[PDB]
A paper describes a structure:
Among these, the homolog kvPepI from Kitasatospora viridis DSM44826, with 53.3% sequence identity to PepI, was more amenable to study. Through comprehensive structural and biochemical characterization of PepI/kvPepI, we confirmed that PepI/kvPepI sequentially reduces the middle β-ketone followed by the C-terminal β-ketone or methyl ketone.
The side chain of Tyr122 packs against the Leu side chain and the β-keto group of PreSta3 of 9 (2.7 Å).
Author numbering: 25 to 190, 195 to 304
Write the structure that this text describes.
Amino acid sequence: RPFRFGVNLVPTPGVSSWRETCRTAEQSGYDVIAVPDHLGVHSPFIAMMAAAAVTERVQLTTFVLNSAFWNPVLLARDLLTAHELTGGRVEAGLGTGAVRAEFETAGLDWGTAGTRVTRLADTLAALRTLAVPTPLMVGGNGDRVLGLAAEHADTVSFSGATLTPGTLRMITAEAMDERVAFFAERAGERDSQVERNTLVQSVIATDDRAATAKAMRSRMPYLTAEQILQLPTLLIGTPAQMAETLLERRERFGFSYVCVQERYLAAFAPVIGLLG
Ligand SMILES: C[C@H](OP(=O)(O)OC[C@@H](O)[C@@H](O)[C@@H](O)Cn1c2nc(=O)[nH]c(=O)c-2cc2ccc(O)cc21)C(=O)N[C@@H](CCC(=O)N[C@@H](CCC(=O)O)C(=O)O)C(=O)O
């Protein structure tokens, strides 16, 4: 599948730069602006509308909604509105919800891993029954979550890191091979209809990728330098090397929809120049 590139921006209360940041994202060649769903961050659909008003080409996506925060019927209303009032520029990523303290602040039951996945399941089923027109993305590496992506999603988002639900450990390329294979088995005949996404956490420009990886072992002692150079959540090297790495990872994992974090927007833009 042809590459699509996204940048995960954080619309921040009290910071007046949102419109400017969105314009920079488009001008730098990104295809998607992604926004998160967290307390203390601007509300995602409202921020996406503000982004749509200053950009003409990018898609806008949630990355990802906390399913506990949304009534499915009211979310379907929001998704139909965002679709119609942007001319079809909105996609919605959904997840189970990550931060317990946020559930508690909003007066919501954290429950169990099982109840949080069931909530996602119930929302996806409802959104499909209501025939929402926004493309749907499902993010997470859990068996049940990837099963839900295989059943319901237009895009599956694989996480390149694990964390205790309640900082982040990066997962090896070999564990990623297994997660993509798991997804593919669950998707069956629908596998080829689902776009595969991943979020790159760090984009490290360097003329010595090998020396960089060796130094980064201190942040990741459970891995060798060779493993670090294959981690899907890291891009290390020159832009040409990063482009070749992304080509190799599209072949290995199927990752064609690659997002980076806001802090790396300019660092990664040369790679868009080479790949497009
Ligand atoms: C928690 C996570 O599970 P997951 O299926 O990958 O993800 C579930 C949700 O977090 C996921 O659906 C999303 O809500 C998370 N999410 C966001 N969630 C949000 O709520 N808002 C966001 O803006 C958001 C952004 C986002 C972006 C990218 C991304 O990859 C995920 C994002 C995980 O790390 N699982 C690990 C660890 C599971 C584990 O072993 N847990 C232990 C350790 C915890 C303990 O000590 O008890 C246990 O439960 O006992 C694994 O599958 O191996």
